[PDB]
Design a binder for this molecule. Sequence first.
Ligand SMILES: *[C@@H]1O[C@H](CO[C@H]2O[C@H](CO)[C@@H](O)[C@H](O)[C@@H]2O)[C@@H](O[C@@H]2O[C@H](CO)[C@@H](O[C@@H]3O[C@H](CO)[C@@H](O)[C@H](O[C@H]4O[C@H](CO)[C@@H](O)[C@H](O)[C@@H]4O[C@H]4O[C@H](CO)[C@@H](O)[C@H](O)[C@@H]4O)[C@@H]3O)[C@H](O)[C@H]2NC(C)=O)[C@H](O)[C@H]1NC(C)=O
Ligand SMILES: *[C@@H]1O[C@H](CO[C@H]2O[C@H](CO)[C@@H](O)[C@H](O)[C@@H]2O)[C@@H](O[C@@H]2O[C@H](CO)[C@@H](O[C@@H]3O[C@H](CO)[C@@H](O)[C@H](O[C@H]4O[C@H](CO)[C@@H](O)[C@H](O)[C@@H]4O[C@H]4O[C@H](CO)[C@@H](O)[C@H](O)[C@@H]4O)[C@@H]3O)[C@H](O)[C@H]2NC(C)=O)[C@H](O)[C@H]1NC(C)=O
Ligand SMILES: *[C@@H]1O[C@H](CO[C@H]2O[C@H](CO)[C@@H](O)[C@H](O)[C@@H]2O)[C@@H](O[C@@H]2O[C@H](CO)[C@@H](O[C@@H]3O[C@H](CO)[C@@H](O)[C@H](O[C@H]4O[C@H](CO)[C@@H](O)[C@H](O)[C@@H]4O[C@H]4O[C@H](CO)[C@@H](O)[C@H](O)[C@@H]4O)[C@@H]3O)[C@H](O)[C@H]2NC(C)=O)[C@H](O)[C@H]1NC(C)=O
Ligand SMILES: *[C@@H]1O[C@H](CO[C@H]2O[C@H](CO)[C@@H](O)[C@H](O)[C@@H]2O)[C@@H](O[C@@H]2O[C@H](CO)[C@@H](O[C@@H]3O[C@H](CO)[C@@H](O)[C@H](O[C@H]4O[C@H](CO)[C@@H](O)[C@H](O)[C@@H]4O[C@H]4O[C@H](CO)[C@@H](O)[C@H](O)[C@@H]4O)[C@@H]3O)[C@H](O)[C@H]2NC(C)=O)[C@H](O)[C@H]1NC(C)=O
Ligand SMILES: *[C@@H]1O[C@H](CO)[C@@H](O[C@@H]2O[C@H](CO)[C@@H](O)[C@H](O)[C@H]2NC(C)=O)[C@H](O)[C@H]1NC(C)=O
Ligand SMILES: *[C@@H]1O[C@H](CO)[C@@H](O[C@@H]2O[C@H](CO)[C@@H](O)[C@H](O)[C@H]2NC(C)=O)[C@H](O)[C@H]1NC(C)=O
Ligand SMILES: *[C@@H]1O[C@H](CO)[C@@H](O[C@@H]2O[C@H](CO)[C@@H](O)[C@H](O)[C@H]2NC(C)=O)[C@H](O)[C@H]1NC(C)=O
Ligand SMILES: *[C@@H]1O[C@H](CO)[C@@H](O[C@@H]2O[C@H](CO)[C@@H](O)[C@H](O)[C@H]2NC(C)=O)[C@H](O)[C@H]1NC(C)=O
Ligand SMILES: *[C@@H]1O[C@H](CO)[C@@H](O[C@@H]2O[C@H](CO)[C@@H](O)[C@H](O)[C@H]2NC(C)=O)[C@H](O)[C@H]1NC(C)=O
Ligand SMILES: *[C@@H]1O[C@H](CO)[C@@H](O[C@@H]2O[C@H](CO)[C@@H](O)[C@H](O)[C@H]2NC(C)=O)[C@H](O)[C@H]1NC(C)=O
Ligand SMILES: *[C@@H]1O[C@H](CO)[C@@H](O[C@@H]2O[C@H](CO)[C@@H](O)[C@H](O)[C@H]2NC(C)=O)[C@H](O)[C@H]1NC(C)=O
Ligand SMILES: [Ca+2]
Ligand SMILES: [Ca+2]
Ligand SMILES: [Ca+2]
Ligand SMILES: [Ca+2]
Lengths: 388, 388, 388, 388
Amino acid sequence: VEYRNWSKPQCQITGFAPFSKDNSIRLSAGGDIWVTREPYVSCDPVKCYQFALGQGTTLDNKHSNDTVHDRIPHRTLLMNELGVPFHLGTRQVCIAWSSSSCHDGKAWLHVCITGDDKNATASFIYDGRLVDSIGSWSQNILRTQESECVCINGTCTVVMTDGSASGRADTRILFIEEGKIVHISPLAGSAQHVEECSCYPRYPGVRCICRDNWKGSNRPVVDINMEDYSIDSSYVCSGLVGDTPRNDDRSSNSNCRDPNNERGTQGVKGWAFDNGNDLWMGRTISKDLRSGYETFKVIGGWSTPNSKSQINRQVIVDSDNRSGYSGIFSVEGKSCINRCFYVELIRGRKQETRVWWTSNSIVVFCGTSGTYGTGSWPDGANINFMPI
Amino acid sequence: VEYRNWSKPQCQITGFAPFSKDNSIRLSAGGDIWVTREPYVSCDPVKCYQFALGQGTTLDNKHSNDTVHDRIPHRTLLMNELGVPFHLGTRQVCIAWSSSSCHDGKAWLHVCITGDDKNATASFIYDGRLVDSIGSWSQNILRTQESECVCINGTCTVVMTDGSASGRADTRILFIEEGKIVHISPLAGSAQHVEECSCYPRYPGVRCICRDNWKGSNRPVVDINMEDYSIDSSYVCSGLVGDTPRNDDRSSNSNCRDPNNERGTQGVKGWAFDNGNDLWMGRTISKDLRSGYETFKVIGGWSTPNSKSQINRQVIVDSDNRSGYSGIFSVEGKSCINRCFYVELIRGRKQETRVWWTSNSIVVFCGTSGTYGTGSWPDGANINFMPI
Amino acid sequence: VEYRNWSKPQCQITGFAPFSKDNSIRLSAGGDIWVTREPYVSCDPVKCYQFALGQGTTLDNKHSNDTVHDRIPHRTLLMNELGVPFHLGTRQVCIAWSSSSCHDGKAWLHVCITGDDKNATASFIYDGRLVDSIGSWSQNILRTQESECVCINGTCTVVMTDGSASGRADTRILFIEEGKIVHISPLAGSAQHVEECSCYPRYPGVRCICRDNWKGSNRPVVDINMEDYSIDSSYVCSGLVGDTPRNDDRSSNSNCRDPNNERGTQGVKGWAFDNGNDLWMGRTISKDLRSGYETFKVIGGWSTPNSKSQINRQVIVDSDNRSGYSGIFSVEGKSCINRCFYVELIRGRKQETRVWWTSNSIVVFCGTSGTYGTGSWPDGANINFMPI
Amino acid sequence: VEYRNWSKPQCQITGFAPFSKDNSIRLSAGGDIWVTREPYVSCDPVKCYQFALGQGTTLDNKHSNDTVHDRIPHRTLLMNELGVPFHLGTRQVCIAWSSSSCHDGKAWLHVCITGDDKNATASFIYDGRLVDSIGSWSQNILRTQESECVCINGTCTVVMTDGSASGRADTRILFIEEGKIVHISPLAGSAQHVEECSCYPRYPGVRCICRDNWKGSNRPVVDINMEDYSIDSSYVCSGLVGDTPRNDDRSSNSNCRDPNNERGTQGVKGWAFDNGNDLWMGRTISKDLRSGYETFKVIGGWSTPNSKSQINRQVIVDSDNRSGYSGIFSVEGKSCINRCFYVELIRGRKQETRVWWTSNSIVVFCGTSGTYGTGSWPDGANINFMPI
Ligand SMILES: *[C@@H]1O[C@H](CO[C@H]2O[C@H](CO)[C@@H](O)[C@H](O)[C@@H]2O)[C@@H](O[C@@H]2O[C@H](CO)[C@@H](O[C@@H]3O[C@H](CO)[C@@H](O)[C@H](O[C@H]4O[C@H](CO)[C@@H](O)[C@H](O)[C@@H]4O[C@H]4O[C@H](CO)[C@@H](O)[C@H](O)[C@@H]4O)[C@@H]3O)[C@H](O)[C@H]2NC(C)=O)[C@H](O)[C@H]1NC(C)=O
Ligand SMILES: *[C@@H]1O[C@H](CO[C@H]2O[C@H](CO)[C@@H](O)[C@H](O)[C@@H]2O)[C@@H](O[C@@H]2O[C@H](CO)[C@@H](O[C@@H]3O[C@H](CO)[C@@H](O)[C@H](O[C@H]4O[C@H](CO)[C@@H](O)[C@H](O)[C@@H]4O[C@H]4O[C@H](CO)[C@@H](O)[C@H](O)[C@@H]4O)[C@@H]3O)[C@H](O)[C@H]2NC(C)=O)[C@H](O)[C@H]1NC(C)=O
Ligand SMILES: *[C@@H]1O[C@H](CO[C@H]2O[C@H](CO)[C@@H](O)[C@H](O)[C@@H]2O)[C@@H](O[C@@H]2O[C@H](CO)[C@@H](O[C@@H]3O[C@H](CO)[C@@H](O)[C@H](O[C@H]4O[C@H](CO)[C@@H](O)[C@H](O)[C@@H]4O[C@H]4O[C@H](CO)[C@@H](O)[C@H](O)[C@@H]4O)[C@@H]3O)[C@H](O)[C@H]2NC(C)=O)[C@H](O)[C@H]1NC(C)=O
Ligand SMILES: *[C@@H]1O[C@H](CO[C@H]2O[C@H](CO)[C@@H](O)[C@H](O)[C@@H]2O)[C@@H](O[C@@H]2O[C@H](CO)[C@@H](O[C@@H]3O[C@H](CO)[C@@H](O)[C@H](O[C@H]4O[C@H](CO)[C@@H](O)[C@H](O)[C@@H]4O[C@H]4O[C@H](CO)[C@@H](O)[C@H](O)[C@@H]4O)[C@@H]3O)[C@H](O)[C@H]2NC(C)=O)[C@H](O)[C@H]1NC(C)=O
Ligand SMILES: *[C@@H]1O[C@H](CO)[C@@H](O[C@@H]2O[C@H](CO)[C@@H](O)[C@H](O)[C@H]2NC(C)=O)[C@H](O)[C@H]1NC(C)=O
Ligand SMILES: *[C@@H]1O[C@H](CO)[C@@H](O[C@@H]2O[C@H](CO)[C@@H](O)[C@H](O)[C@H]2NC(C)=O)[C@H](O)[C@H]1NC(C)=O
Ligand SMILES: *[C@@H]1O[C@H](CO)[C@@H](O[C@@H]2O[C@H](CO)[C@@H](O)[C@H](O)[C@H]2NC(C)=O)[C@H](O)[C@H]1NC(C)=O
Ligand SMILES: *[C@@H]1O[C@H](CO)[C@@H](O[C@@H]2O[C@H](CO)[C@@H](O)[C@H](O)[C@H]2NC(C)=O)[C@H](O)[C@H]1NC(C)=O
Ligand SMILES: *[C@@H]1O[C@H](CO)[C@@H](O[C@@H]2O[C@H](CO)[C@@H](O)[C@H](O)[C@H]2NC(C)=O)[C@H](O)[C@H]1NC(C)=O
Ligand SMILES: *[C@@H]1O[C@H](CO)[C@@H](O[C@@H]2O[C@H](CO)[C@@H](O)[C@H](O)[C@H]2NC(C)=O)[C@H](O)[C@H]1NC(C)=O
Ligand SMILES: *[C@@H]1O[C@H](CO)[C@@H](O[C@@H]2O[C@H](CO)[C@@H](O)[C@H](O)[C@H]2NC(C)=O)[C@H](O)[C@H]1NC(C)=O
Ligand SMILES: [Ca+2]
Ligand SMILES: [Ca+2]
Ligand SMILES: [Ca+2]
Ligand SMILES: [Ca+2]
């Protein structure tokens, strides 16, 4: 086994075709399925696996009630081949309430986070053994990606926040070579917040499309130079914008460098990925609520401010339904590195308060240089059927 | 790993001996089993696996109700070793409501179909990565085999329809070398319809025994020349005939070249496989309803029109019971390539409307050059026991 | 991989120490466990697996009722590593209502039997493919071992009956080299019946301790000469005797050559295995009912008629409980070939008619050249707890 | 595969970071989970597995009632990768009511104990085959570690008691090279009792931190010389002390050589592990009841009597909750051998007599040379939710 160095062109995609759905909630009505959220999928040179954080229980468990809350001791990081539901036979690869995973080529690094909010811990596991540990630095919740990290040559990047969701924060980018952090590099850029970065291998570095829970609703970019550790974090030129809540589609703006301050409040985990001066991206159809999922390409959107030349749309999930988080997902072709992407479809309380638990399914789409039809793939489960 | 080139004689079989049953419905009363239909089994140089399309749920799920319908977003392609039931621990290898799978020798290609009926998409997955995509072409349901495709030397064939079930249609035969379609070839032949082809490796090409939902009740043949892409599609000389509904057994006819127009309406997925001028084939015992399964050899039936010299019958499934689809299943011997075949036994609504869900079990029989006894293997599950 | 030729001394054992129990019935009250009976365990050069025939269902299935009957279409041959219960995730390796399995070294041969009683079929599977088939020969139930077959050099033996349980019968010994029967050899010996042979590798041939459902209650021996195909079947010299029902322990007799005619009626699957002029054997404590299990060594018992010098007893299962079938189980040491043995503990109807289903657990003991304590390991499950 | 010889420095740890929790009880409310207790985890050069002894059943089984009792025929030794719950798909690797497991490098040795209390047996399994057996020697319960044994060069140590819990006893240290005991060595030392030793590879020998159910509440040390078989068993210099029940924290004492006689009665399985003249150890927060878990380092505590210079505490499990047993768990780093440790959290009768069954979850922590936060990880399951 030599290393995963990614030297190879990205694919000139033409849109996305469907790859995987698991029906996690549906089956949850007839089987014992874990309680999840904040999923993501990543793969080694052979199989694509699917992760997510549980709630130390199952859905048809009287326990599950109040799964709305993101952190609790009993939450663990699951793993399965891409395609199997999360069952009583799944493994809790580590304790955590946040994470990131990359396959450096040789084996896995699994950053998993847990502790008190104000003082928590981050175990850096690798190849099964626990290679390192680094604790919270601001004293107000150490959180990470909830997406696949990226490694190149033998060094795995991973961005980390601990600060004030809607406020300033310390963003560091740890460079851990084999479960062992070997160098940390402090954030720099126009980016007024970095959180839930969706990172990918666009050689020689790593580029990140994050979230901004404070003033921006136009994703902040985070570019890592795996070559010298230096950082750079701009903002997206695309005038379209994909974050929720967000202004609209006409008064929606972005100048590639400053929080736009338009419902710049919260956010959601999102992705995007360049191609020349263009921009393949995705977001919720609803711009108030996290419902419906569409994906598209903005001409000029990566190199040019306030763009609006949308083209090649797709209604991945219908706007009458509901989605949630999503992240990019790379996966090296036999000549080019193709990007893929996932979408958790969250069914549960706060919204569908018919039941008291919260969990989620997933749908995933990859890159294609061929045709496709049209459609939308939701969780599609009868909340009047589901237990509780 | 060199390639699967099939250069090796087919076996001079003498009838079929039992191989596998899974009891899918029976266990479904005491366990959490997926909701299926349109199964098939295929194997790599080591294990035989069993496929089928689910209904994004399980049987003891209040959801399952109305599984009669063939397409919906939440239907996925399962896979398991030959012998295990479809459980909560099975994987959804792709989203689809149609498919085909072959092992080119090195790894798997998994055509899976999904989208709106009128406009749908076909993901061409291979080795886990998504190599290509080609969308619907007539705008009225892109459908494929629901049986194992066949590869030789490194090129995998797969026939595709999109048109009018009971009407004309476009039938194309895609030649995808490694998840990448590299050449499409348009249908040609006496065949007035091609749909649900049951294809196999009868070197140097590939030969297909399809269905005809319009005017024929005598299977149309579809011969592929993997050598130059050319096509040829005749009809079966056998005067016996195996399709349901169908005329009878005396006024049942076929001339090897034109729809016979005798209850030539619908059909069901069927198989057949030559041997000299003869014909080993199978069909439902009931010629109105898809009930009971028998298999036999018609002397003269492959090279001679309107044949009736039946011999070596078997009551695979009793005519008091019920079957459904079926397809051929090859599996290379240590000197000859033996054919095997499967039979879904569909238990569910429209018929057994005691319950509201529809799923199916399976029985499978291989080729033998030795003796056998007699019997019939049905789903045999108490519909008064089953849930719902 | 060279072949399993067994050239290596058997171990001078000193008694049996406990190896495996699975608690099949107990868990059956809190989980979905298959309905079984007629088990046995066998191993390849790495793992020991556990077999048995199911009843196409699970225990907490309303179907299971009337599992007392041995044959029905929906019965299949399971397989799992030695230690896991038979779950909804177990595989039906073949259809059958009888069987035998050996690992010739390279891979598995799985004789499985099914068909009408009067006319049935026997599929000879191997390495996943179906290599051969041979049908019933007397027209009254083709049955086999229900124990591990034995292979040496590359030829696998397997004894087969079809005749009259309590009457004469045809006993043949098929020699199948790679799923392909290559020579059948007709039974010869003092043995007035051969049925449920418990066979083992006592180089250069294979020796069998069977059952006799007609006139004997003293196990008939069946010695195979894998060298020239010739057969020889004596009877056990041991005057102790181990079969149920059986006379007693004082008027119990055997002369090494003729059915003794003492409650010589039915039987049960049993084992035994020589050592010099002695005899390590096992049987039920109850000599009317199949309850309790003990094992011991009779000095002189293999080379001398009507023996009674019992020594080294063990109460494997207490006589207040209940057992059933049992068979020998070899397993090559790092210098000597050690024998092991299993014991199904049948819980169910006809006896414990509190419930209407019948299934069974298992306990297994191997050979030891070291000390041991005392005890008894029953199914030990509350029939008042169990479902139905 | 060469052998596991451990020549390599232990790691200068700085405290413990979280690795694994499984939520065994929580899921037990929504799934079929085995009934356990007396767990432990151990690993081969690749995966870390988790063991424990069951109670031949599952929790939602009416059987489980009265799982308070430690021994019964139907108790078996489970095994799974580190992270999966104990499910109906787990294997019973042997019958036992006590055990120990080490990976000599090449494969596993699994001492499992069962029999009458007064006369029991100990099967010494290895690589799947049963290599040896040695029976009880005092006639009053042969018990072993309930923790991972340690092998070096090719010889696996394992300490064994059989005597009087609160009285004298015979303590032997068997040296079994490949499932075959090749030399037994009798205990020697100041140690007035050895029971439930928590052993580890501190090259060239093996050192053990046991329990004392008679007069001590200050762990007895047990040092093995794998070099010449000689033994040595002192007591811990640490004046802090970690055993429950125990005096307090001020009148708590130890002189490194004699039972201190302060609530020196019972105990619990514990661990500890040196580092220079210091001592990293752990115990229950409650000194009467086995509740809460903390871990720390006592300066001077390994080489100096009655120590009280505690530092680097952690509240692993909060004192408002409840723990149970615990043991050390080694795991070779890429330059140093890191120690890890587990903690069963027992939920069940005698205490939480709301229900009638007893089982347990687990939390596990490894060694780190990096920072960490703070927190506590309990079973945290609603006893008012749980079944029974
Ligand atoms: C490939 O396949 C697409 C699939 O797109 C999606 O369709 C759903 C909505 O139809 C969406 O939720 C789902 O998840 C799919 O992802 C092909 O067509 C698609 O469907 C139609 C047009 O073809 C577009 O959707 C619209 O949605 C409305 C809700 O269904 C529908 O009622 C709209 O209908 C109005 O125009 C149609 C035109 O055919 C016609 O039916 C009527 O005239 C109708 O008029 C309305 O007017 C009044 C006010 O609204 C009402 O009082 C009156 O009752 C009536 O509702 C409309 O059809 C969807 O966007 C479209 N997709 C795309 C990409 O165009 C598409 O043909 C093909 N394209 C490509 C590149 O392959
Ligand atoms: C190997 O094993 C076969 C197994 O074949 C199948 O048998 C079932 C039907 O019997 C079928 O559903 C099942 O699934 C099996 O696959 C051996 O025999 C088989 O069974 C019989 C003859 O041997 C054939 O089946 C017929 O089915 C009727 C329903 O059971 C049965 O009642 C018929 O019986 C009439 O003739 C028999 C001859 O033995 C005799 O019983 C009576 O005289 C009976 O007369 C009827 O007459 C009146 C009008 O019908 C009634 O008023 C009166 O009450 C009575 O019903 C018949 O036996 C089945 O086809 C046959 N299989 C084959 C291949 O022949 C077979 O012996 C052997 N062959 C080979 C090559 O190995
Ligand atoms: C290793 O370990 C053995 C284990 O053997 C088995 O014991 C159970 C029966 O006790 C059996 O079902 C279980 O499954 C075990 O496999 C050691 O001992 C074993 O137990 C005893 C003797 O040691 C033997 O079993 C007998 O079973 C009767 C039912 O329990 C029991 O009541 C008998 O007791 C009579 O004698 C004992 C002697 O100690 C004493 O208790 C009394 O005096 C009692 O007297 C009876 O007399 C009247 C009529 O019966 C009654 O009115 C009165 O109430 C009372 O019942 C007896 O103890 C069992 O066979 C034995 N096993 C072996 C191999 O000896 C054994 O010590 C040791 N051996 C070796 C080689 O390692
Ligand atoms: C990293 O993270 C630690 C986590 O430690 C643990 O905290 C829980 C207890 O708080 C424990 O069960 C849990 O499992 C954790 O493992 C950081 O702090 C930790 O929490 C606090 C202090 O920081 C310590 O715990 C104490 O526990 C009491 C129960 O919660 C709590 O009420 C105590 O509060 C008293 O002092 C605090 C100081 O901040 C303040 O809140 C009040 O003044 C309060 O006063 C009480 O006084 C009267 C009598 O008690 C009452 O009438 C009145 O109502 C009120 O209760 C206290 O805070 C815990 O030990 C501590 N851990 C450590 C290691 O210090 C820690 O800051 C950081 N350290 C490091 C190295 O990283
Ligand atoms: C990184 O990319 C590839 C794959 O890791 C490296 O491997 C060699 O690269 C090219 C073609 O890929 C040739 O020089 C060798 O034949 C490759 N070997 C294999 C097994 O692919 C490549 O050298 C690395 N290069 C950079 C610039 O990072
Ligand atoms: C990672 O991969 C290759 C590893 O070799 C790095 O490029 C190499 O450049 C040196 C001189 O710097 C050559 O001698 C190497 O052998 C080059 N690669 C090849 C295939 O020749 C590359 O620049 C590194 N990139 C990153 C992002 O870390
Ligand atoms: C295709 O069939 C076989 C198997 O793929 C090819 O392999 C060689 O073929 C024959 C015997 O099978 C000999 O020439 C070689 O010894 C074979 N090698 C092996 C490993 O079997 C064969 O050459 C191919 N031929 C055609 C005509 O397609
Ligand atoms: C059968 O037994 C063994 C094992 O199959 C054969 O293997 C050779 O036998 C001996 C020692 O076992 C030596 O001649 C070789 O070194 C063995 N090789 C191995 C890999 O064990 C043996 O020759 C066979 N002999 C008979 C008489 O059947
Ligand atoms: C099975 O195994 C060995 C295979 O070699 C057989 O014994 C051999 O005897 C021949 C001459 O007959 C020698 O040249 C072989 O090489 C011998 N074995 C060895 C290791 O030398 C053996 O007799 C056969 N036994 C059975 C029961 O089939
Ligand atoms: C035990 O430790 C190591 C690992 O088992 C042995 O292996 C050799 O040891 C050193 C470095 O580890 C060198 O002499 C060799 O290069 C090692 N080989 C490998 C594959 O690591 C070591 O010799 C053994 N030594 C002792 C003292 O027990
Ligand atoms: C276990 O491991 C090594 C095995 O070699 C033992 O040390 C060896 O010492 C001899 C002379 O005694 C050398 O020739 C060996 O080759 C040494 N090891 C190495 C790598 O050179 C060691 O002392 C043994 N220790 C224990 C606890 O059993
Ligand atoms: Ca925002
Ligand atoms: Ca038709
Ligand atoms: Ca008899
Ligand atoms: Ca004590």
